[PDB]
Amino acid sequence: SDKLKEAETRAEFAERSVTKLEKSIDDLEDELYAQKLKYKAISEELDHALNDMTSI
Amino acid sequence: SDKLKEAETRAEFAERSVTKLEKSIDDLEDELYAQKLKYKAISEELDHALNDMTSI
Amino acid sequence: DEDETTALVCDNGSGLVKAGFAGDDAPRAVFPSIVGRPRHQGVMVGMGQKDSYVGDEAQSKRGILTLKYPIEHGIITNWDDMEKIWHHTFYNELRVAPEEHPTLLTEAPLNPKANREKMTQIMFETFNVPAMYVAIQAVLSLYASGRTTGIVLDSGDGVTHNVPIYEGYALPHAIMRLDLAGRDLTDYLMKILTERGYSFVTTAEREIVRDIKEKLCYVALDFENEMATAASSSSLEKSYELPDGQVITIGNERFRCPETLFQPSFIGMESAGIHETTYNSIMKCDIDIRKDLYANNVMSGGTTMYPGIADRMQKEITALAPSTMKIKIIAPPERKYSVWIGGSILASLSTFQQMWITKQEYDEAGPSIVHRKCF
Amino acid sequence: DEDETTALVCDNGSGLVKAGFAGDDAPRAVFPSIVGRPRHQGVMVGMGQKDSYVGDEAQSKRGILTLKYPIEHGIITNWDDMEKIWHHTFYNELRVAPEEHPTLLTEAPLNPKANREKMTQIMFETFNVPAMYVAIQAVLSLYASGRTTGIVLDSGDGVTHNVPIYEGYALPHAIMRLDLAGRDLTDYLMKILTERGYSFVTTAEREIVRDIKEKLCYVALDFENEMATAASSSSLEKSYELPDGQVITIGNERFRCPETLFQPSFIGMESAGIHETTYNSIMKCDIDIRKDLYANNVMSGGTTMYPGIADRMQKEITALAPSTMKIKIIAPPERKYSVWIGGSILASLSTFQQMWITKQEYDEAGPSIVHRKCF
Amino acid sequence: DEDETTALVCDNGSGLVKAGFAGDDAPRAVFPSIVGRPRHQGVMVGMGQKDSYVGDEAQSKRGILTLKYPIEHGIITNWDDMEKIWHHTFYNELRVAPEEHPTLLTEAPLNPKANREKMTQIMFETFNVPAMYVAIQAVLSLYASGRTTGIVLDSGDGVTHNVPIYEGYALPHAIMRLDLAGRDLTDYLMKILTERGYSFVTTAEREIVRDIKEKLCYVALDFENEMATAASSSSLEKSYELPDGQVITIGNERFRCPETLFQPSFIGMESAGIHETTYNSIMKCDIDIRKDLYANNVMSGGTTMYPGIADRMQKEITALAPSTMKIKIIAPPERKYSVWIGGSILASLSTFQQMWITKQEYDEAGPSIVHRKCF
């Protein structure tokens, strides 16, 4: 019974670590996707300005 | 004893999940880093363009 | 029984039955859908001598009973079997009478309409439930996720369904059912174990090998390279302790069993892997929202307790679809109860009793009323 | 082979390939556009062990082959597949060498110009045809009808095209392509039969259910009233004898399958029924001739063998358009060969060899010459 | 809402609705004139389930809605649609009540008088606007330019109008409407992209291809020479990144799409290019001022954001007209808001409230009063 309790404690520790890392990954994931949405926007717009060079 | 093997099973499950999540976090943070740096470089260049506009 | 007349919430999932009361967080009576019958006739006396055995009783009495499945891939064998198991669940397991509590049930996706009409009619005649509602498990898993956008992969024990739902609206035109499920997994593992020297046919070993799938199985990151390195693989090879005490060692098979769903050509299906079925499903609908479907895919079912589905899923979809937007899967722990949770969610709000299927409506229009009352 | 150097006439219709000699009344070699490939690998010896299977050979060997479509809705998968099937048609089926006979081909309406340039280039390099001409199937069906005024509804197996032509002139500004065709019909019928209890995915059952569509299907005169009376409908309900011997009974589905083209909202298309597509097409052009278009509508394709398109067509157009002038449809029996007949008609007259696309023109200007030689 | 009772300024342009307060420089609520409706029926609950969707909401929900146009080329389908969109604009977008602010509206040139009478009557009954004024968008664009002499080319999304006005005087005898507009542009581009291998029918791809027209399209300086050099044109060929992530490459089509307005014979119009329509318009009026019309031409509309209209315009007019006097076009940036700006200009001066169309005048003479109160 004592060994079962120690193993259960360690398993619960690991599982809480799992959940916390998953939440951190979520936050990072959202930030990276937004970063990239705006990166592609600014890149396209620099290209549009270059198109302006073509129109000139 | 059956409960103890089940505890060891869930512990190993959670530990493998932890390792996967840690590696994912590291790679995601490196990718986000490089992405933000490239966006910062383009933003730099665009700021220089704004400064030139002001000089006009 | 609670003093209040709260509703019954019962998920008759294809592989597991999970029943309880509305307002509860988890179903109270959860049992597999196996049903045991006496393998021989009666000559002894003093105990036993009972026909139907259901639930943990049959689990303990697996060896003495012919183990039969009243439902397989949605098809219904004998309504009497459901009658008995529902009696057992309501009275011996839930300790509840269906007279005073309306029932919310969940059904397998795209279940026969004739099946619905017959099951509802036998139900209403046999039982005295005051009111009724039945819903597809897809929207239930959606409710458990609590996000109106996404494609649900329901991996039951008889069928795997891919259903896209955008902003809480069903897309039947892009919904498909695949005949690969737990049964296939057990079969394929059975033949591989036969090639490993152990050849069993009976259902007890079926449950043993599905337990092995629950415990030890991998989802290979790269298939042929992992068997190539699994040639010897003393560390990678993994063993199990069967209840009789023998140590059974399995290596590449751990990740060669779930792979069959991904690679159906192993045992001869024209349909490609389930990732192709999610891919085609996505493109059938308008182009624009497809990216959101990529980013909002959900997976549900008891099988989902296995590792490896998430990484394989994302990598293959990114291989098939352009890698601009980031694809991420969401799957809450213990999601096999999630459907039942959604049932409780349905009973949570006060609008749900506006469309209870009451006794008098069925008495007026027969079973046909459900054709107009649910959809 | 005929002693004379008469031309080859080949209709590569989207769903059927019909090939023969010029001056003939009907194509000699007619086969569906399915292509079968070995489902597994080679270990046996003594017979078979051949990759490509085309024509009736693949029809007999449907079960053992993965059945794939080298063309779907005009899109080209693998030119090698066309290479092999044309080899088979010319030598094993037509018993003709393309060296000594120029080829007249028909292409699906609004086919890609890049598709034309690549197919012509691979053709000219691989084959040794002396001369070439390719035409749209719309004017071919017009020629089969032999009336320069009318709107052609070409219902192939991948696309349905509506094309107006007044006094023998094309109106591309009022031409449209709809992604509803045989494929959709089979799909929709597949899901309804799934709701009837029979769920198949493979192509053999696809051909079985399209055969069912050929034999038993109705076009409902009034839709919801006919399902209302088809509730029981012992007489109206119709059965089929599947080759395995089981009797499969279908009722309202007979007229609920083709209705989907008329009512696309069943499986989610923004475009309305094909009658709306003919209507809009008509009004896009000048008002005055519209009446003639109403009175001169033609329908063409293999699907046209089904009953019910004519009555539905006229009634709905009369509902949409004023009912002063009388609208009448014309459709000669066995019109799926009609396009090929028109090809023979093209070779009938002595002016046709003024604009054969010879080898030396292609050698001079590359494929680009067709851009100036056909249109 | 401002403390002052200043008037509402609303431009219901054929393609865009731009609304705001008088005295403001730019309209506050600007949205396209598309309207989305639920593609299917209601079975779900908990969210959504709303009929009309307008503005950015419908833009986000484009895939789930049938996208319909309440106005096309001036023709009105359903006044209820305008009722709902005006409700949305006034309360959900402008956060203003029309009770306390008179409305200045702009209408498409040569709009039906019956249309004006019905729209004004439904407006006055449904709404409680204190006072009214409606004006042609031509004089509004003139006001934005602030020069009483010139010919206005109003290129909306349904019609293109050429209207000459000399010294702030309308010339209806020399005003014409051409049925070429954004719709035609999208259609023609749709058929060319179909010939490029990509065939779509739904409205989401319509918006995608009009976005492509906004971004990449050219106006060819010389047409056939530019396709001749665009044969290969690796540098001249331009690509777009569609939101799904696929790279779609287009070459000559960039300048072959707007060319159709200049060359209507591509898809069959008797009327020649819009430059011919400005030319005829000019000569219809007295000879002498024609030179001023040549030198004072103005162009207005959202399309004007594209490059190439100015150079093409001047060169062709100089080709048609004698090249003694210098022709120059004027077009301020962001001129699609210019009409609304002119509306604010109308409210700027204190004489404008002398001819507000008050409630009591309409109550006395019905809608007919506008026949005497505006013109």
Ligand SMILES: Nc1ncnc2c1ncn2[C@@H]1O[C@H](COP(=O)(O)OP(=O)(O)O)[C@@H](O)[C@H]1O
């Ligand atoms: N704790 C668990 N771990 C792993 N697999 C499980 C577990 N419980 C059940 N399963 C698997 O789930 C399957 C039953 O699926 P089920 O959840 O009934 O599908 P559905 O979601 O359609 O009801 C069984 O065949 C079993 O192999």
Ligand SMILES: Nc1ncnc2c1ncn2[C@@H]1O[C@H](COP(=O)(O)OP(=O)(O)O)[C@@H](O)[C@H]1O
């Ligand atoms: N004898 C028949 N009766 C009914 N339908 C048929 C028959 N033969 C072919 N079809 C249908 O016609 C379709 C093929 O159309 P097809 O004639 O190839 O179009 P196209 O005229 O564009 O070549 C097939 O999908 C099949 O279902």
Ligand SMILES: Nc1ncnc2c1ncn2[C@@H]1O[C@H](COP(=O)(O)OP(=O)(O)O)[C@@H](O)[C@H]1O
């Ligand atoms: N920023 C933009 N760049 C290029 N084209 C645009 C832009 N905004 C709108 N348009 C085009 O303008 C059209 C709408 O014209 P609109 O300005 O409503 O005409 P009107 O001036 O008669 O109101 C749309 O079809 C769209 O293609």
Ligand SMILES: [Mg+2]
């Ligand atoms: Mg499941």
Ligand SMILES: [Mg+2]
């Ligand atoms: Mg056809």
Ligand SMILES: [Mg+2]
């Ligand atoms: Mg305009």
